[model samples]
Target: MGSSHHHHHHHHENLYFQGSKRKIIVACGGAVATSTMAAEEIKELCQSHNIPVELIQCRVNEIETYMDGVHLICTTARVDRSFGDIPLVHGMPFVSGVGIEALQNKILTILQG
Candidate 1:
């Protein structure tokens, strides 16, 4: 067994997902520049995968309220914070242009849930 990481939700192979959709939050210091750039980068994945996600944007200060229904949190800053069960990724790579392949994999991992 290589990877047994999966939920018992369903075993369908259909490309489109969710009446049980996924949600992601892309946030940054001022909710500009990097946040917008990362969010745009994320959209390509969503578009190509046919995932219907509600990708929301917020100032890092407003992130607390946006977390309630989010599955993944992508942030441009290396701020030390926690999202409990919800996973977070360093989104700066979406802007700086390195480590993006791994970042995209981490994103798809959570989406597969």
Candidate 2:
């Protein structure tokens, strides 16, 4: 019976993942402090949920080059250019801890889809 329980738990571990790796762009005006903090929080969130994600930190100006194939963009400051269909999230919550849950949920929802 104990052996069966261990096997069941192992099976669940494999079932934890439901999607492919996601690409996230963490951007700021200068790609310094705020973007760094947002990226760290997002990294933790992805790891905890077992969601595979690639986080790229860059300046808003440099984001255009990396935009191709990106799943989401989280920015600390206002974006100057339009991102078209890709989702753009205001990443302030990661630093302020105010709307963190909502931001996290939005990211997860997109990743799961």
Candidate 3:
């Protein structure tokens, strides 16, 4: 029902994730230019907080392919038509250094247990 999707423990084989690495996958929809820009902002914002983040430019249809290890999924204005049952975090402002911590906390809390 949102632009982004979150799948808990979706993929455990992403070598980039671990006990406390806080696996993060930034997902987006729409044109490549817009999505990539958003992803870059997210990566920078996350890096500012010393958080590990990865960016993936995907079409509305491929949201699920990149759902693995995606603790918090940030997206653009376009939402997926069929996201299955994933939780999405609309993080436009968050990527601009306004709500990264809140998102991080949520992810940490979920991973800590």
Q: Cα lDDT of model 2 overall?
A: 0.68
Candidate 1 structure quality by residue, lDDT tens digits, 25-61: 7776555565555667778778888877878777666
Write model 3 residue lDDT over 1-113, tens digit each, in one string: 56776666675555633434434445554554655555665567667667654555555445567676555555544565355656565666554665656776775575446
Candidate 3 overall lDDT versus native = 0.56
- For residues 5-104, write the lDDT of model 2, one tens digit per residue: 5563355434433225667777665545655656677788778878776787777666677777677777666675464776667656666767777777
Give the alpha-carbon lDDT of every model: 0.68, 0.68, 0.56
Worst ten in a row by lDDT for model 3: 16-25
Q: How many Å off is the CA of 6 in candidate 3?
A: 43
List runs of model 2 lying over 4 Å from the truth.
Answer: 1-20, 29-33, 80-83, 101-113
Which portions of model 3 miss their true places by more than 4 Å? Answer: 1-33, 77-85, 91-113
